[PDB]
Amino acid sequence: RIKKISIEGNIAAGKSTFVNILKQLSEDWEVVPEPVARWSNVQSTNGGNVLQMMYEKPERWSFTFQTYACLSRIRAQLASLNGKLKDAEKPVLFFERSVYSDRYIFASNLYESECMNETEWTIYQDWHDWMNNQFGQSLELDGIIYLQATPETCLHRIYLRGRNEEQGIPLEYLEKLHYKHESWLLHRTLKTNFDYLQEVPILTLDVNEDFKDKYESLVEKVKEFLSTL
Amino acid sequence: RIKKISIEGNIAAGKSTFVNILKQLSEDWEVVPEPVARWSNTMSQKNGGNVLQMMYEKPERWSFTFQTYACLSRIRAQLASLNGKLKDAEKPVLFFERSVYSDRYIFASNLYESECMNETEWTIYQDWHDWMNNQFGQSLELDGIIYLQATPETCLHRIYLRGRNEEQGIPLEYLEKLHYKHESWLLHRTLKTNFDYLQEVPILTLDVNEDFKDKYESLVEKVKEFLSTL
Ligand SMILES: Cc1ccc(NC(=O)c2ccc(CN3CCN(C)CC3)cc2)cc1Nc1nccc(-c2cccnc2)n1
Ligand SMILES: O=c1ccn([C@@H]2O[C@H](COP(=O)(O)OP(=O)(O)O)[C@@H](O)[C@H]2O)c(=O)[nH]1
Ligand SMILES: O=c1ccn([C@@H]2O[C@H](COP(=O)(O)OP(=O)(O)O)[C@@H](O)[C@H]2O)c(=O)[nH]1
Ligand SMILES: Nc1ccn([C@H]2C[C@H](O)[C@@H](COP(=O)(O)O)O2)c(=O)n1
Ligand SMILES: [Mg+2]
């Protein structure tokens, strides 16, 4: 089977930018991008933007978004496992975010932020729990690449990307998710219902400096982490 | 193997009355109660109550949240029943109080048409339903459907006979809109579904208009009949 690697990080940290660098560095190295486009134009597998609806009235749409987001990821991630990489010697599938960061970082943060009531949040937890243990050892990650950046850098990279929905985001929101990231992957004190995660290796890279051209060091680091996997 | 039959019908038609009768008749006969119907009385049941109270309170906000949890519940209950006591029983039949297809094609459909679910809610629901079902519940495919036919008028009476105070509000107009949905689907079979096999699933239509609580003999004799013909 394929080594499943997850690239984690805050909003605008540099996930797609870095994951594209690695994507290009090898055949049998493939990527599973977060389906942000499906959330942008809700068309069935013209249509509304559920990423916008959530940022505009989070108290109204957080649960509906958080649900479609996770489901769209699950779908995509599975769909890739079946991809050409199946018939390819020594393969590596690089996932842009994971089912673990949807719940324990974003959805968790919204419930805490009072944008999901106890009921909304319980339903989501039971759904995520039940739904995830229906694959077994299928979507289990082999390793995690944490792309570390200040919530300050993120706010600036949000303002470079220039996606309308998120131009309203305050430092405080990024600051909240940052802390959640640090507790999950750096200090590793964020307990999850996924007991295997406890023994999963994490490579933490400080992607604060504009690595777009100065990325050789970052790539040397991934290649070493992957050998040890 | 276990034969899957679903009991379909409008509100207060007599589904829960019939699934109880059938349950008592055979050791080989097991029944799967509607999650909604239960909640119309342990976190899976605690959430149920909460969401159903909000559902009545403001259907414009909780239609998606409800039709979602109520359907995941159904899949979870039915997948659990398949691995139950019937597994090693000589000639087993599993009766389902309403199906995963009625949730979507009658109720969830009606709520999108009521404007209680917007287009974006509706797109996501249809997509969530298409996926959940094609992955997890591919076994929960039906062997047959027993339609419990009753005039919207009959149901309106049996809603009072029931007495659930929230239910006492339900207009005849609402029951008439749901009636025509059932009739188009199961009786005329003009209702188009995303599930291709439902074009050739056998349907026994029973006229539950007369009180069957005490004269259920013939009704069961026609079921016994239908079961052999699968
Ligand atoms: C369980 C429930 C409670 C209330 C409602 N609907 C309403 O209560 C309601 C109220 C007003 C309108 C019309 N009006 C349109 C315009 N907008 C702005 C307001 C509403 C429509 C529906 C649906 C449901 N949904 C539902 N879904 C599945 C099953 C059942 C159900 C209920 C009882 C017994 N058996 C099954 N019920
Ligand atoms: O070294 C870097 C990495 C990222 N970015 C910019 O930061 C924004 C967000 O990047 P990305 O989509 O990769 O972030 P993600 O949210 O996927 O982590 C984009 O405008 C990038 O060009 C940048 O200027 N320099
Ligand atoms: O032959 C019958 C069947 C049902 N009922 C009454 O109909 C009401 C609702 O029945 P049920 O719960 O079976 O309906 P469902 O909503 O499940 O279709 C209850 O008060 C029953 O006692 C009745 O009077 N006679
Ligand atoms: N469960 C999730 C997943 C993603 N997002 C948002 C954050 C971004 O605005 C976008 C995904 O792109 P990014 O790579 O910038 O995080 O969706 C969210 O709020 N909740
Ligand atoms: Mg992105």
Residue numbers in the entry:
A (entry chain B): 20 to 64, 77 to 260
B (entry chain A): 20 to 60, 72 to 260
What does the published report state?
In the present work, we identified deoxycytidine kinase (dCK) as the target responsible for the sensitisation of various cancer cell lines to gemcitabine, using reverse-proteomics. dCK is a key enzyme in the nucleoside salvage pathway and recycles bases and nucleosides originating from the degradation of RNA and DNA to achieve the biosynthesis of deoxyribonucleotides, which are required for DNA replication and repair. This cytosolic nucleoside kinase catalyses the 5′-phosphorylation of 2′-deoxycytosine (2′dC), 2′-deoxyadenosine (2′dA) and 2′-deoxyguanosine (2′dG). dCK is also responsible for the initial phosphorylation of numerous anticancer and antiviral nucleoside analogues. dCK adds the first phosphoryl group to nucleosides analogues and is usually the rate-limiting enzyme of the overall process of converting nucleosides to their deoxynucleoside triphosphate form. Hence, dCK is clinically important because of its relationship to both drug resistance and sensitivity. Previous work has revealed that dCK can adopt several distinct conformations, which are a function of the nature of the nucleoside and nucleotide bound.
In order to understand this activation mechanism, we solved crystal structures of dCK in complex with masitinib/UDP and imatinib/UDP. We found that the masitinib pyridine ring mimics a pyrimidine base in the nucleoside binding site, while the rest of the molecule extends to a cavity only available in the ‘open’ conformation of dCK. The binding mode of imatinib was similar to the one observed for masitinib; however, the pyridine ring in this case was slightly displaced from the nucleoside binding site, as the angle of the pyrimidine moiety (meta) prevents the pyridine ring reaching the bottom of the cavity and the pyridine ring extends to the sugar moiety cavity. This structural observation could explain the less pronounced potentiation effect on dCK enzymatic activity of imatinib vs. masitinib. For both molecules, interactions with dCK mainly involve non-polar interactions, without direct polar interactions. Additionally, for each ligand-bound structure, a supplementary electron density was present at the top of the cavity, likely corresponding to a second molecule of compound interacting weakly with the first one in a similar binding mode as the ‘F-series’ inhibitors reported previously. Moreover, it should be noted that masitinib and imatinib were able to open dCK in situ, since we were able to obtain these 3D structures in the ‘open’ conformation by soaking the protein kinase inhibitors in a ‘closed’ dCK crystal. The binding of these compounds also released the monophosphorylated substrate (2′-deoxycytidine-5′-monophosphate), observed in the ‘closed’ dCK crystal and still present in the other nucleoside binding site subunit, elucidating at the same time its mechanism of action.
